[PDB]
Amino acid sequence: AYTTFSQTKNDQLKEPMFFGQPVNVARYDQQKYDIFEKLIEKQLSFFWRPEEVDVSRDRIDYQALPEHEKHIFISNLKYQTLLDSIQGRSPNVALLPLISIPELETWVETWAFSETIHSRSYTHIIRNIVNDPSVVFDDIVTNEQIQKRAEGISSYYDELIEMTSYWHLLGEGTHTVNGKTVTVSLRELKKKLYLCLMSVNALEAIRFYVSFACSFAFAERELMEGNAKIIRLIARDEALHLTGTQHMLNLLRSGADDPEMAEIAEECKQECYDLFVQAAQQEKDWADYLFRDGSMIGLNKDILCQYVEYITNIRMQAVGLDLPFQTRSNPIPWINTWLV
Amino acid sequence: AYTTFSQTKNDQLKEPMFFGQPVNVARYDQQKYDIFEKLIEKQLSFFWRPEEVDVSRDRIDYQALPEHEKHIFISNLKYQTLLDSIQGRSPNVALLPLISIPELETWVETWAFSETIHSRSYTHIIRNIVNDPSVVFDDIVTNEQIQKRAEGISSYYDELIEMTSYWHLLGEGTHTVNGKTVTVSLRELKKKLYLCLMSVNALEAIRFYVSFACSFAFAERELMEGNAKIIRLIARDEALHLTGTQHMLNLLRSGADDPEMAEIAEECKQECYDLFVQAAQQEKDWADYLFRDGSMIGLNKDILCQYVEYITNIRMQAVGLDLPFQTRSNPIPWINTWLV
């Protein structure tokens, strides 16, 4: 029963984050949860444009890199481009139709917009360092290592989108669609949302941070400094995005927003643990792909895989999951210097 | 049907604007249509923050206004807030799932983001001029005159979203759901899109400009000057937005993008004309509501109705529709001071 302007006057302070009545009036004078307004304000204050970053010496650096270092750099860049191609559209297509408070609605839209800026910055880098940009962009879709991750990530979004359509069109209960029976459960839809949000937390809080490590490793060598300047703007946005989903998941599990969600969150714990561990293992397998033909000064498979474990523990803890790894310390303390 | 990352490698330059393969890679190094990239670049260069505009001197002006002038100002502001509450979410929810070209995908998200800025500016104004913002915001939803406009505009979006959902879930052809026969036609869907785009063209190109006229009329008397500074930035964005929909409509109707669209455009040309005239009439009826307790220096019902007719002819001609009204020079040439 979705609508772009819900005609019944509701108290927006008493609506849940998700699955309530679609937002009508966009107002910002009051908030259920302070965090979402605070994030919008911060994101707006961070506004930047890629094309105003000088990436001219980055071509020289890139072309001078040996084959395997080109491979490390470009594989990383293609992965970042993939991830934010998804993040550009997906929060709008998947989350926006389900939101029932204004501050969250606008946060999601501001968040997705900032991702389009990141995507634009990747085009800016690629067209300025590479001879044939199309080769790079085409490979993002066809690269077998990349699509493995694309497949898994997009699925959490796609399954949420599809089940939302059945819920908006048929409502709860058991139905008949061209003979076949289709079950529509709001509880299952809430599970699909929680799981998707958990996946998106891992993507922004873990997957992107592994990629930031690769990019900043070049900048430690005073190479690809134009790129580095851009990544540090991107990571600064990413810290906000990850904070967003952290709060969403933690408010959902605490039962404060929706009591049904706390039940669902507890029955999900294992799947949540598993998908984070699975994400970590994928990033570790990706480290193998990056370093298959050799390593570079300041970054190899052992360093990157330890970082994967370290950052995973920290991100899992922040959303109340168990720490899967014994790793206690950061092998790349210089990353904190680059991160804002 | 819909996926947040389509797995098949496609030439994005030969996709249609809408209904083609969902965008995978967000790239900006090439474009099917130059206009959408140009609008993104322009919109990004225009970035502003309402909170940076001094609206503190506006409260004394507003409270000082006679009751009918308060009625004129606040009715206008409520309508503006209504329209961009819709414009904030709707391009994202209605159009995004249908776009098959990356530059258009990003334009739509950039356009929708800029609308949330507009919404925030309205909160910024409302908070700084009235005693209890809640009564203003709630009346946006309950006001019988305002809601009349909301329901009409909402319908074009809502009907597109619903039919899009059926087309994603069931595909085209005749189907049955819970005994009821439902027919899904892509042709019917394309018509819904075109009509929606025509409605959004009228909203931004006509409805908002009528509202700018009201706002700038106070500014001519050196009243509500903070609000005026904000409207200048809003109108500058609005010029971009309506250029967006003009180009979408003209590309669709010319057969340059999709031959089936050129044909559908002619088929519902009369509906398009009737849609715009009905919008013009609503705005005239709105001016009547605005001035039912009296008028002000520079603006009354007669003058505002002349402006409605004046811009309606310009906008209708731009999208290839017949002119419903007489020829006249700009009834309010003082508005040029405030525009661009």
**Facing residue for A24 by CB, picked from B123, B133, B141:** B141
Q: Is A309 on the interface with B (CB under 8 A)?
A: no
Residues B1-340: name the CATH superfamily. Ribonucleotide Reductase, subunit A (1.10.620.20)
Q: Which residue has the tokens 């949540």?
A: A272
**Phi/psi of residue B183, nearest 5 degrees:** -100, 125
| Resolution value (Å, 1 decimal) | 2.2
The answer to whether the CB atoms of A49 and B44 lie below 8 A apart is: yes
Q: Which residue has the tokens 């990004």?
A: B44
DSSP letters for A185-221? -HHHHHHHHHHHHHHHHHIIIIIHHHHHHHHHHHHHT
A161 vs B contacts (CB less than 8 Å) = 2, 4
Provide the terminal-to-terminal Cα distance of chain A, rounded to the nearest Å: 43
Q: Residue B37: closest CA among chain A residues belongs to which residue?
A: A120
Q: Which residue has the tokens 């605070």?
A: A38
Contact A283, A206 (CB under 8 A): yes
Q: Of A65, A4, A30, nearest to A293 (Cα)? A: A65
**SS3 at position B300:** coil
CA atoms of B267 and B153, how far apart (whole Å): 22
Helix (H) or strand (E) holding B140: helix B133-142
- Judge whether A122 counts as a catalytic residue: yes
Residues 44 through 63 of chain A touching chain B, CB cutoff 8 Å:
44-45, 47, 49
DSSP letters for A282-335? HHHHHHHHHTTT--BTTB-HHHHHHHHHHHHHHHHHHTT--------S-S-TTH
Q: Which structure tokens are listed for A110?
A: 């501001």
CA atoms of A104 and A295, how far apart (whole Å): 43
What are the residues whose beta carbons fall under 8 Å from the beta carbon of B242, sequence distance 6 or more? B201, B204, B205, B315
Residues 163 through 192 of chain B touching chain A, CB cutoff 8 Å:
165-166, 168-170, 175-179
Candidates B116, B119, B135, B151: best to mutate against A (most CBs of A within 10 A) is: B116
Instruction: Name the DSSP letter for residue B124.
Output: H
Q: Which residue has the tokens 């903070």?
A: B226
The answer to whether the CB atoms of A85 and B24 lie below 8 A apart is: yes
The answer to whether the CB atoms of B4 and A161 lie below 8 A apart is: yes
Does B159 count as an annotated binding residue? Answer: no
Contact B226, B53 (CB under 8 A): yes
Q: Of B172, B20, B156, nearest to B91 (Cα)? A: B156
**Phi/psi of residue B94, nearest 5 degrees:** -85, -40
Point out the catalytic residue in the list A79, A122, A157, A209.
Answer: A122
Q: Which residue has the tokens 């308060």?
A: B70
Q: Which structure tokens are listed for A111?
A: 């968040």
Instruction: Name the DSSP letter for residue A80.
Output: H
CA atoms of A120 and A118, how far apart (whole Å): 5
Question: What residue segments make up the domains of chain A, in order of their start?
Answer: 1-340
Q: Of A72, A68, A82, nearest to A147 (Cα)? A: A82
CA atoms of A3 and A332, how far apart (whole Å): 49
CB under 8 A, 24+ apart: contacts of B273-276: B273/B316, B273/B321, B273/B322, B273/B324, B275/B195, B275/B198, B275/B199, B275/B202, B276/B198, B276/B202, B276/B206, B276/B312, B276/B315, B276/B316, B276/B321, B276/B324
Longest Cα pair distance anywhere in chain B, in angstroms?
64
Torsion of CA A175, A176, A181, A183, to 10 degrees: -20
What are the residues whose beta carbons fall under 8 Å from the beta carbon of B11, sequence distance 6 or more? none
Contact A23, A12 (CB under 8 A): yes
- Burial profile A72-96: b = 16 or more Cβ within 10 angstroms, e = fewer: bbbbbbbbbbbbbbbbbbbbbbbbb
Taking only Cα atoms into account, the Rg of chain B, rounded to an integer number of angstroms, comes to 21
The answer to whether the CB atoms of A88 and B109 lie below 8 A apart is: yes
Our CA-based measurement puts residue A308 at a distance from the nearest CA of chain B, in whole angstroms, of 25
Does A71 count as an annotated binding residue? Answer: no
Q: Which structure tokens are listed for B22?
A: 């969902």
Q: Is A94 on the interface with B (CB under 8 A)?
A: yes
The answer to whether the CB atoms of A92 and B90 lie below 8 A apart is: no
Residue B84: CB atoms within 10 Å: 25
Provide the terminal-to-terminal Cα distance of chain B, rounded to the nearest Å: 42
Distance of CA A90 to the CA centre of its chain: 10
Our CA-based measurement puts residue B166 at a distance from the nearest CA of chain A, in whole angstroms, of 8
